[PDB]
């Protein structure tokens, strides 16, 4: 479950960064 949570947060953070860059 911690793998799931950490990975969701990591992917969402990546999406936020990408949207900012775009
Ligand atoms: C999965 C979640 C990733 C954990 C990231 C660690 C949190 O990050 C930490 O949060 C603290 C909260 O006060 C801040 O004080 C630290 O400066 C910040 O680096
Ligand atoms: C699934 C594809 C997502 C692509 C994410 C692109 C992240 C970088 O994107 C590019 O970044 C440049 C500066 O960093 C900007 O000047 C460009 O306009 C932006 O397109």
Swiss-Prot record:
Membrane spanning residue stretches: 1-19
Coiled-coil segments: none
Site annotation Essential for channel activity, possibly by being protonated during channel activation, and by forming the channel gate and the selective filter: residues: 13
Site positions (Seems to be involved in pH gating): 17
Protein location: Virion membrane; Host apical cell membrane
Quaternary structure annotation from Swiss-Prot or TrEMBL: Homotetramer; composed of two disulfide-linked dimers held together by non-covalent interactions. May interact with matrix protein 1.
Domain-level remarks: Cytoplasmic tail plays an important role in virion assembly and morphogenesis.
Other comments on record: When the channel is activated, one or more imidazole moieties of His-13 probably become bi-protonated.
Role according to the record: Forms a proton-selective ion channel that is necessary for the efficient release of the viral genome during virus entry. After attaching to the cell surface, the virion enters the cell by endocytosis. Acidification of the endosome triggers M2 ion channel activity.
Family: Belongs to the influenza viruses matrix protein M2 family.
Name of this chain's protein: Matrix protein 2
Natural source organism: Influenza A virus (strain A/Hong Kong/156/1997 H5N1 genotype Gs/Gd)
Location of this fragment in the whole protein: 25 to 46 of 97
